[PDB]
Every structure is written in C-alpha cells, then in structure tokens.
Copies of this chain bind each other. A is one copy, B any other.
Amino acid sequence: GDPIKSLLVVGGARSGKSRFAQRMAEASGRSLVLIATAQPLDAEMADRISRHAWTLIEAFFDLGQTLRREAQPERLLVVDSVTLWLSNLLLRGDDLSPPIKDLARTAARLEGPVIFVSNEVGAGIVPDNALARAFRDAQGMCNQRLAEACDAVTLVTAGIATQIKPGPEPVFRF
C-alpha cells in the first residue's frame, strides 16, 4: 500500500473507524503501540477499552508529548481516540486551542508513523450548553488541523473507508 508517516481516520460513533485503524496497523508489520486516551472511570468506558482490546501506553492528557517520546521508525502509534483526549482536557477546564495546535505540529515531525482515530461530532444540532458547544467547536478545529498536518485522511462511514487526502480539492470560477 501507499507509504506514509501520518494518517487521520475520522468517523462517527460506532462507525468502524477503530477497527479500520487497528486492522491497518496489524497488517503493517510494524511494532504496534496503542496510545490510550480513555480514562477508565466507569465500566462503560472500561467495556469499550476491553472490546477494542500491541504495547499499551496511557496518555489521558499529555498526548502530543507521549507521541514525541514513543514514536520510532520501527513502531506504529495508534491514537485510540483524539476525541476522548479533548474531552479529558475540556472537563478539567483547560483551554483547548494551544494543545490542538501543539498536536498538529507534533503530527508533522514524529520519529515514526502514527494513525490518529478521531470522531466527527459536528453534523448534528447545536448543543443546548456551552461545554458541549465548545467541545464540538474544538473537535471540528482539531480534525481540520490534523487533516492539514497528516499525509493521508480517510473518512469511515458504516465501516467503509473513503480516502479524502491525498486528493485534488475542487476549484470553481465565477
């Protein structure tokens, strides 16, 4: 397949994006590292970690710093959820802009390859509360910045992956 340094996989909830990333990583022949961002505070979350369940590294908050110091040419890092990392930062009261831009810059310079698995959260109605609105905005921005940084971007819909980067973007004259 096409040789790259960085892939962003975007999909909705229970879209198959994690299975797509996990089977791409398992097919790669690299040393696999799951970068796990989910805080197993309850059994529903441990349940989703168990279902997905490789070297496992927890990175609930320091995702970018973890990528920089775990990435190796011989390793493939899979970020289990960009979304759950952002959630962790938001709930704590952290400003989300700097870590997002820091992560995109990191995505551009790793010592080894990385797949980022991230949710689309922006294609429903406006949330009725400011925390959910901020989260929706920050996740949308984050996916834009990661798509710009990464070599390749795939959208996963109903378990089917479509490549959207590389790809020529449309141009219109008026």
Residues on A facing B (Cβ under 8 Å): 1-5, 7-8, 10-16, 24-25, 27-28, 30, 44, 76, 113, 119-127, 130, 132-133, 135-141, 143-148, 152-155, 157-165, 167, 169-174
A140-B170 in contact given A8-B158, A147-B159, A157-B10 (Cβ < 8 Å): no
Q: What secondary structure prevails in chain A residues at the interface with B?
A: mixed
Query: What residues on B are CB-neighbors of A155 within 8 Å?
Result: 157-158
- Chain B: which residue is nearest A16 at the CB level? B144
Query: What residues on B are CB-neighbors of A130 within 8 Å?
Result: 44
Checking B122, B161, B164 against A15 with a beta-carbon cut-off of 8 angstroms, the contacting residue is: B122
State the copy count for this chain.
3
Checking B14, B139, B141, B163 against A170 with a beta-carbon cut-off of 8 angstroms, the contacting residue is: B163
- Whether the pair B158, A10 counts as a contact (CB closer than 8 A) is yes
- Chain B: which residue is nearest A25 at the CB level? B174
- Whether the pair A144, B14 counts as a contact (CB closer than 8 A) is yes
Question: Known contacts A14-B136, A14-B137, A147-B160; can you find 9 more A-B pairs with CB under 8 A?
Answer: A1-B170, A3-B172, A13-B123, A13-B140, A28-B174, A119-B123, A123-B123, A155-B157, A160-B164
